[PDB]
Design a protein around this nucleic acid. Structure first.
Ligand SMILES: [Zn+2]
Lengths: 84, 50, 58, 154, 62
RNA sequence: CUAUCUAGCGAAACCACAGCCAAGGGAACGGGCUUGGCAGAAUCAGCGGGGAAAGAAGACCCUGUUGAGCUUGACUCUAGU
RNA sequence: AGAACUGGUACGGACAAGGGGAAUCUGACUGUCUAAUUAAAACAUAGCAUUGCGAUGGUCAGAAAGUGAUGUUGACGCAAU
RNA sequence: GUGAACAGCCUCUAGUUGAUAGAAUAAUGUAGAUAAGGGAAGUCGGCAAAAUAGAUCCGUAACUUCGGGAUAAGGAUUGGC
RNA sequence: CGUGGAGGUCAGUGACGAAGCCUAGACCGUAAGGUCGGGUCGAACGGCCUCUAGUGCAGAUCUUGGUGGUAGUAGCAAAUAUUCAAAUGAGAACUUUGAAGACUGAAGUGGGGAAAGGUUCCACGUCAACAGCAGUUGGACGUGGGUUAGUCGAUCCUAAGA
RNA sequence: AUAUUGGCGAGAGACCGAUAGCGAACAAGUACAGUGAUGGAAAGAUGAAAAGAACUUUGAAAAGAGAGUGAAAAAGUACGUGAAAUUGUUGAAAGGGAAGGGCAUUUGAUCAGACA
């Protein structure tokens, strides 16, 4: 049977977790993630996946550092002691 | 499985600590829209694909 | 040699036992309402098979 | 607590209500319709005979394809049945109405059941799994029940 | 009450299985406070619990 | 073991409105129209004549200035050599 | 292995457990395939024959390359029918 | 234990005794059996079912690549003491 | 005729009840439609001259949502099989114990494990939902506890290969 | 001088007004499906204020009936108003193998108008 039986022989993964996006996309017979070529330096992105370019792009996360630069520019990238 | 990794175990631990209800004192706040926990998960219904 | 229980932990943080019960009941109810809704709103296009073979020609 | 259309006074009458009950609308309706207009004492005596499988309940509207019997003759019909969940859930509101009355000060010897109506309630839903990899509903038909007793005057 | 876990512990203690164990039916209240395994040991020697005898498989006709 | 009766639980297909016939005419084979025959609540188990029964915007045939798989000494070109 | 005796002639006492024969068509055989309508006389097979090639090579590949399969090979071989 | 046998059948250790139930025994069905006399007349067609079935002894043809065919066919026996 | 919005106007209506909604109650208009009374309800809405459009649905195997008849119907029928008493409890065909009967019958309905699952393990409490009947039971719900390695394995080696 | 459907900050609209307008007015690229690439939703409103129904009583318990809060429970967290299909109870009426409709009138129900 090509169905209800042959869904029974499904117990070994062709995918596991990428260390750069954290989802089950790391093909392991070949070692490349399918949503961001991990060994590759560039993140996988194509301009036909314009939805995918919202689920991963800037603004999605914390923006630990980049959230503060408009605050720092406004003040002129000043430094030193706050004030009296 | 039994002979597992640590990444997996760590994620399972997270999913455990997530598998609790909503604390009732949340519901008494002054502007609250949260009635229950909708990100709830149990091994019968939904498998976490890790 | 024991003092603490979750009940004594939640006594201070607002809800007492009867309010825990009365909260759980409505919490469960609002969890079940949405299930009734999800089943209704899926029931149409759950049985929609992409490649059903229709074992009948003669 | 807004009730249906009762052509009788609230002073000489008591009330009861059950909501979101998990019993079948169709079989509770026929049960209630079998005791409308009756005396309580001759109703509770009758719903207990039902469960003892004497003095059945007639099925007049929701009666298709069911079977015939001999305890329909005192109601004329031939299709009747003995629904012992409808019965219990009704019998437990008669008790409540009698109590409400006895605490309002009404004499339980001349009380009759004036208004009684069953409604449909929201369905509580599930799935049954049919052939060829499909799904179909398998859901209940709950019932609101609403009841009124009043004491017969001239 | 519900002495299923008591029956489990009793088998585990005695060695025999869950089916060669006999808990006295007149002593449910006292068995139920056997929330432990060191209590079962007290009960086996008080006789409230019993290791029933092997069912017999004779070999004489053979 | 079912079906059947009962307690409980309880879907689906399908559905213009619907549901007695004959002949007539009619989109040439009516459940409805016309003329007649007839006609009495509510109904249970079966049945498989019928509802040109249900399933599927016929698959055969044809048309389309719609395509595809394949072949060749068809037209126009091409990797390679 | 044998002999008596014996029974309602029963006795591989339940279970288990080959129907047989004469002929024709076809494929040699064992084997393989259409997972979910075709297990077949089709495919494969050994066996027979033919073709190319002596390495600067035959067949094949690759967008290309200081690139590759056969080839850890060498005609009693590799490749194609 | 039977038996050639990890077959089937029964049992010990261990485990379960769960599968929605009750009552009744109509048609038509699903699954399993029997059948007088005849014995494939049925039917596209012996489809289905039946018969044979184990072990021991005897006896075993045409044809043959001499290896087989072959459990050929075809007969008898089978317990208990 | 009508709808959503715009500019002017009635120094327009209105919490002493706007809009909306129900009304086999009334009036006008051929008609599209407009107006009134009653009940309900609770905050904004209209007539007129003009502007402007995402402007009027019975239909499209229309889209989404919802609800019906059929229907308390088909039907919950493989897996040999259940029964008595008691305890618990609001309540027991189904929970627990005991007694009986029976099954798997060691290529098992036993005892462990690899993949996989992920806390389903164990206890205490509990029944609204789930267990296509029931449920005092539970792989459910709620709260918590729980996995101890110099010797088992990974770790190390290399195969096809990358 | 020019470009700028991205980012940061500002101002506005003869625009949509929760099946609309961004897919997302809400814990939305969330839940969920799929091996994976990718796909991808639903879901806003109690009231001015929780004052969120003390207390009594029947019940095993949910809940009910009384009480009570409130301007209003015809606002009781299933909460703004709360349409229709569909459904229950009551009341009226009719009803031989359909129902419904058009003209005309009887009978019944209702409305009319005072012309004081
Ligand atoms: Zn990745």
């Amino acid at each position: 049977g090509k169905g209800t039986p042959s869904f029974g022989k499904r117990h070994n993964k062709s995918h596991t977790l990428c260390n750069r996006c954290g989802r089950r996309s790391f093909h392991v017979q070949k070692k490349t993630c399918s949503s961001c070529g991990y060994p590759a330096a560039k993140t996988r992105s194509y301009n036909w996946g314009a939805k995918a370019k919202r689920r991963h792009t800037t603004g999605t996360g914390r923006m630990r550092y980049l959230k503060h630069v408009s605050r720092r520019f406004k003040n002129g990238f000043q430094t030193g002691s706050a004030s009296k | 499985a039994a002979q597992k990794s640590f990444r997996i175990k760590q994620k399972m631990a997270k999913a455990k600590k997530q598998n609790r209800p909503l604390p009732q004192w949340i519901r008494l706040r002054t502007n609250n829209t949260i009635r229950y926990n909708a990100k709830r998960r149990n091994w019968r219904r939904t498998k976490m694909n890790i | 040699r024991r003092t603490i229980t979750a009940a004594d932990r939640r006594m201070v943080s607002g809800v007492t036992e009867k309010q825990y019960k009365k909260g759980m009941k409505k919490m469960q109810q609002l969890e079940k309402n949405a299930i009734n809704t999800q089943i209704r709103r899926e029931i149409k296009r759950v049985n929609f098979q992409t490649h059903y073979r229709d074992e009948l020609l003669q | 607590a807004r009730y249906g259309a009762t052509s009788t006074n609230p002073a000489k009458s008591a009330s009861a209500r059950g909501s979101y009950l998990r019993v079948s609308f169709k079989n509770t309706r026929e049960t209630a319709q079998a005791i409308n207009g009756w005396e309580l004492t001759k109703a509770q005596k009758y719903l207990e005979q039902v469960l003892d499988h004497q003095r059945a309940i007639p099925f007049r509207r929701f009666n298709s394809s069911i079977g015939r019997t001999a305890q329909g003759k005192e109601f004329g019909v031939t299709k009747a049945r003995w629904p012992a969940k409808s019965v219990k859930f009704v019998q437990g509101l008669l008790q409540n109405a009698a109590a409400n009355a006895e605490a309002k000060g009404l004499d339980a010897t001349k009380l009759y059941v004036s208004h009684i109506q069953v409604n449909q309630a929201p369905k509580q839903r599930r799935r049954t799994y049919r052939a060829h990899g499909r799904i179909n509903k398998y859901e209940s038909s709950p019932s609101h029940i609403e009841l009124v007793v009043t004491e017969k005057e001239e | 009450a519900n002495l299923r876990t008591q029956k489990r512990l009793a088998a585990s203690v005695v060695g025999v299985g869950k089916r060669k164990v006999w808990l006295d039916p007149n002593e449910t209240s006292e068995i139920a406070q056997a929330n432990s395994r060191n209590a079962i040991r007290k009960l086996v020697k008080n006789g409230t619990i019993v290791k029933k005898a092997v069912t017999v498989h004779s070999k004489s006709r053979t």
